[PDB]
Amino acid sequence: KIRLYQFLLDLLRSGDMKDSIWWVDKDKGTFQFSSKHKEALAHRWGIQKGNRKKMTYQKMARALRNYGKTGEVKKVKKKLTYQFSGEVLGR
């Protein structure tokens, strides 16, 4: 089953939800969610996963924060903005 960080990277590469998520500095791997349209993207994540409940952006971001220690995704000090690691971007 796909991991959350890979789901997000795949969206960014395909452009499929460009109103919900976008690169800020693609060379650095920084990306940002839409304040008004992030819930549609969260819903898609939960449906892809087959989760019992409807996914919310809050719960998705709770999972994103768990990558901070291992490093795949880190929060950036800008609204709704995160950053993939170089390792993630290379693969």
Next chain:
DNA sequence: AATAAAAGGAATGGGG
């Protein structure tokens, strides 16, 4: 106040 982002502890659930 109303709204929103950010945080994380802790319990619970997936699939090995």
Next chain:
DNA sequence: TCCCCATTCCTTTTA
């Protein structure tokens, strides 16, 4: 057994 990789719930803090 017990880690993987979240999901869900609840509360707090900051803007």
